[PDB]
Design a binder for this molecule. Sequence first.
Ligand SMILES: CC(=O)N[C@H]1[C@H]([C@H](O)[C@H](O)CO)O[C@@](O[C@H]2[C@@H](O)[C@@H](CO)O[C@@H](O[C@H]3[C@H](O)[C@@H](O)[C@@H](O)O[C@@H]3CO)[C@@H]2O)(C(=O)O)C[C@@H]1O
Ligand SMILES: CC(=O)N[C@H]1[C@H]([C@H](O)[C@H](O)CO)O[C@@](O[C@H]2[C@@H](O)[C@@H](CO)O[C@@H](O[C@H]3[C@H](O)[C@@H](O)[C@@H](O)O[C@@H]3CO)[C@@H]2O)(C(=O)O)C[C@@H]1O
Lengths: 133, 133
Amino acid sequence: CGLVASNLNLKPGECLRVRGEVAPDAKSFVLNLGKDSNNLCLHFNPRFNAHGDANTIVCNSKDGGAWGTEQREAVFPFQPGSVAEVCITFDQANLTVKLPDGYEFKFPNRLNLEAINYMAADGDFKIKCVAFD
Amino acid sequence: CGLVASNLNLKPGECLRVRGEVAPDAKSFVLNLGKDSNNLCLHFNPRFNAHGDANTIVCNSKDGGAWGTEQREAVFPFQPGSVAEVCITFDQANLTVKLPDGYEFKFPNRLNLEAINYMAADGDFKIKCVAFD
Ligand SMILES: CC(=O)N[C@H]1[C@H]([C@H](O)[C@H](O)CO)O[C@@](O[C@H]2[C@@H](O)[C@@H](CO)O[C@@H](O[C@H]3[C@H](O)[C@@H](O)[C@@H](O)O[C@@H]3CO)[C@@H]2O)(C(=O)O)C[C@@H]1O
Ligand SMILES: CC(=O)N[C@H]1[C@H]([C@H](O)[C@H](O)CO)O[C@@](O[C@H]2[C@@H](O)[C@@H](CO)O[C@@H](O[C@H]3[C@H](O)[C@@H](O)[C@@H](O)O[C@@H]3CO)[C@@H]2O)(C(=O)O)C[C@@H]1O
């Protein structure tokens, strides 16, 4: 596994900033946000070459261990062998995922947790810094 | 009870940078480093006014759940209601906690672990940024 952070206490409107290095031969990496490994209000999974997919951003939720309905973005502003920053926040309706250069995605808040207390990173993505505004 | 990070995989030489907010009513705060909650190669505990200690830094280790012998430092470069920055490293001999202005606190490496996999904040210290350099 990669980095796992708990007790984040990330309230609505507060910002979680993660920056890491994407491997030159990356196939996929994951940012899991929620309450624990079984309860994720956001499964953020850029796939470079994984699960039959290529250069596709896959998001989903996991509620009580159960995956929800997958959603995919058309754009893919991630490059293997480069540094990537992802800023996440949320309200009662949506999680908002931003990237430093104009890119912004919305994903439905399906769990409606009080806060984001759990973050797990995995795959070809070496985290360099995490910041909690 | 504060931020807890695991799977850090911080090897000797690698630098852990932490920036946080010391509470205005700060009596004490803690940075725990090691393998897990029961195996800490460094218990870094600046005490403003706690457990009978005033403006004193208390370091210790925990090995298989058992606390070691406390080491105390006279120099106290911390202020309540402020921002504190520390950089942490270790080698075979010592753990080293560095502050920006030049302060350098050393604590003997008692556990001799391959890496720092675990970090936990506690007390009057709210972590705002963690970086791996
Ligand atoms: C054990 C293991 O390696 N865990 C992997 C888990 C799975 O549980 C895996 O099936 C175990 O063998 O899968 C991981 O990624 C999944 C996740 O990204 C979800 C998001 O919705 O999608 C899953 O793939 C989907 C695919 O998106 C769909 O097109 C359709 O094919 O269904 C498949 C499979 O249901 C991913 O497998 C995970 O993070 O949980 C990767 C783990 O390493
Ligand atoms: C960990 C937890 O759940 N609560 C706090 C604990 C408890 O008070 C502790 O388990 C019961 O005393 O206290 C914590 O800090 C302890 C730690 O800093 C050790 C370091 O060796 O010192 C303890 O105080 C010592 C003191 O330094 C000595 O001079 C003498 O007075 O003995 C006391 C008690 O042993 C601290 O209590 C901890 O992490 O264990 C802070 C927790 O929030």
